[PDB]
Nucleic acid binder design. Structure first.
Lengths: 88, 76, 177
RNA sequence: AAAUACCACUACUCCUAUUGUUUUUUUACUUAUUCAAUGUGAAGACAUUGUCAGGUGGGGAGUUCCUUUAGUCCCUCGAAAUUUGAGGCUAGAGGAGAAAAGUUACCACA
């Protein structure tokens, strides 16, 4: 068993998009996660992946909804940052 | 959650009271400063907010089970 | 000194959630409108107030050595590790807890896995490979580690039998002396 | 260390008064300033904001300084007085680039 990171395996385009791939052996732009909203969404993902299977449908719905709300709040936070830096 | 069956269901069913505990802790002050406290075999349908808060605090501070497991920080 | 990236906090929070229950409180704002953040100097991770981090940014990179509480180190393979320095947060917000007698705490202080013969108190309903903080009967936090068996198997286990695998003990303070 | 009689000087510490200057703290008020509205009200001399000197900068854009050694007892700064320490000069030695790279008589597994 060997890692696909070790092997020079190209990325394949599936239902999950490849996106703008980054060149090998080059500077990939480090994106720093420092907004409390961004830690909110990451922590929500971690807690969901840890808790796992909840029997109650409404509980599943609520954990998924808090994930979506964290993503949303991050989205308006980034949009506000963009507007601030674009006009002011 | 103090029903025996739900008591045993607890962890397997992922039943947590933390939100209610925090709500009680954050609402004690309004319950202190509101006027209608004493304008009033049943376990829920009690007409007085004073006895309602008494049941709340008995449940939290002295739950009928695992009396020697209550978090000291919550206690204090 | 840099803030963590997305994958790095994914890994760090995975470890902290494997041994802890609440982390929104960890990242919760304080009364004075300040919050705890995560930073990486060299290869070690650190839990510290934002104000302290912003006041410590003047120190040259090569001239910084500590900041807040060291929660562990990222490894050359990109895998996080916890430390005896990261213990107190785990003590504050632990998921599972195991208490050992003096005659096992002294072994655990020398770096030995706990066994049924030395355990004296348990948390009911504990999975086999769970996250347990090791205390004594005087509730001083002594370490953290992974349980060897579940609770029932621990009960029916031979008393000369490992119940919790050591992963970090207080003796490292006698190493870095 | 310094020796007292004699008479000459300026050196600070602690108080007083008026024949005066500034700097800082607290309090009070609107004229500095901030917010709301259109075809005047409130806050308040604090914030906010601007200009230089700096510290850091693993983020963004562009291109391919200190330490040691030996010397003239040649210059500057700090200290102490009957000498030192830190720099300065001469020329040897150290420190494609945030992607990751190199290494170990060590550890675990295979």
């Amino acid at each position: 068993v060997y890692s696909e990171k070790e092997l020079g395996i190209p990325q394949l385009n599936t239902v999950t998009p490849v996106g703008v791939t980054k060149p090998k052996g080059k500077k990939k732009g480090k994106v720093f996660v420092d907004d409390r909203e961004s830690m909110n969404t990451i922590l929500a993902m971690v807690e969901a992946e840890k808790q796992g299977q909840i029997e109650s449908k409404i509980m599943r719905a609520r954990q998924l909804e808090e994930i979506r709300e964290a993503r949303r709040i991050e989205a308006e936070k980034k949009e506000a940052e963009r507007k601030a830096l674009l006009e002011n | 959650l103090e029903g025996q069956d739900a008591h045993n269901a607890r962890s397997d069913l992922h039943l947590d009271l933390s939100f209610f505990i925090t709500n009680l802790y954050r609402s004690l002050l309004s319950l202190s400063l509101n006027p209608d406290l004493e304008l009033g075999n049943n376990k829920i349908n009690l007409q007085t907010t004073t006895v309602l808060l008494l049941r709340c605090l008995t449940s939290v501070l002295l739950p009928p089970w695992n009396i020697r497991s209550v978090p000291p920080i919550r206690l204090a | 000194m840099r803030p963590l990236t997305d994958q790095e906090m994914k890994i760090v929070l995975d470890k902290l959630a494997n041994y802890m229950t609440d982390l929104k409180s960890l990242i919760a704002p304080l009364e004075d409108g300040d919050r705890y953040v995560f930073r990486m100097q060299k290869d070690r991770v650190y839990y510290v107030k934002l104000s302290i981090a912003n006041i410590a940014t003047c120190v040259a990179r090569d001239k910084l050595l500590s900041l807040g509480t060291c929660l562990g180190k990222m490894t050359k393979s990109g895998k996080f590790r916890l430390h005896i320095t990261a213990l107190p947060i785990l003590a504050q917000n632990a998921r599972y807890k195991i208490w050992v007698k003096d005659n096992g705490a002294q072994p655990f202080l020398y770096g030995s896995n706990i066994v049924k013969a030395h355990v004296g108190r348990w948390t009911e309903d504990c999975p086999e490979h769970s996250g347990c903080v090791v205390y004594n009967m005087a509730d001083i936090p002594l370490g953290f580690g992974v349980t060897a068996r579940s609770t029932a198997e621990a009960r029916r286990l031979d008393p000369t039998g490992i119940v919790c695998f050591r992963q970090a003990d207080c003796g490292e303070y006698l190493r870095d002396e």
